Amino acid sequence: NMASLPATHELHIFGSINGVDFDMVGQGTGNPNDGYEELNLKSTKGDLQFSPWILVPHIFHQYLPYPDGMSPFQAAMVDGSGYQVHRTMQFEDGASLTVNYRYTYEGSHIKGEAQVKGTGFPADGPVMTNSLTAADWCRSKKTYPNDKTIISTFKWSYTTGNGKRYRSTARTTYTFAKPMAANYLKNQPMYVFRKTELKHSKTELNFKEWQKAFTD
């Protein structure tokens, strides 16, 4: 499957944060043997009026291998059957952010479409005042309640400029067109440690992600 696993990708991520529209597009690459991703995005609607960190972690688990071979995400890309994704994040200050994903594949190139709705961020808070500066390591837990569904949960924390943490909880649901292989369903839960990096201006960002799946 080396030729059918992903090597390059692009993302169109769009929607609104507090009812204000944004839209970004750009190109990336990654390594499906070790989880790595890197992505450049540029705004198509002018300066971003909120912290670009709010788009992290949302800005391609097709790059995630499992400990003993392909992940289900990889398997579903390689056989063309695919999957869809929905995530909800609920923040300590009562805000929410939803995102849904659809993908298409052209050989080893992935095209992603991510539709975002962020609601209820306080005007004064670190999102709307562009005061987020980093994100903690994050441990995700994946369970498989049936042969076509993965549920992933995690707690998330950003660091802010004034040394506070800004916390949220997330639940992600994956819907597979074809049943997942039996070994995945037997070997649950699966955990994944990830780390993200972001450098940004008001119009452009450079993102990186590292991922490592494990049981015990």
Binding site for Cl ion (CB under 5 A): 152, 172
Nearer residue to Cl ion within complex by CB, 100 or 203: 100
Contact 188, 157 (CB under 8 A): no
Q: Report, in Å, the least distance between residue 203 CB and Cl ion.
A: 27
Nearer residue to Cl ion within complex by CB, 48 or 192: 192
| Count of other CB atoms within 10 angstroms of residue 136 | 14
Q: Report, in Å, the least distance between residue 121 CB and Cl ion.
A: 21
Nearer residue to Cl ion within complex by CB, 43 or 152: 152
Gap between the Cα atoms of 27 and 74, Å rounded: 20
Find all residues with CB under 8 Å of 33, minimum gap 6, and list them: 5, 65
Nearer residue to Cl ion within complex by CB, 168 or 172: 172
Contact 188, 197 (CB under 8 A): no
Q: Report, in Å, the least distance between residue 85 CB and Cl ion.
A: 8
Q: Report, in Å, the least distance between residue 45 CB and Cl ion.
A: 27
Burial class of residue 210 (count of CB atoms within 10 Å of its CB; 0-12, 13-18, 19+): middle
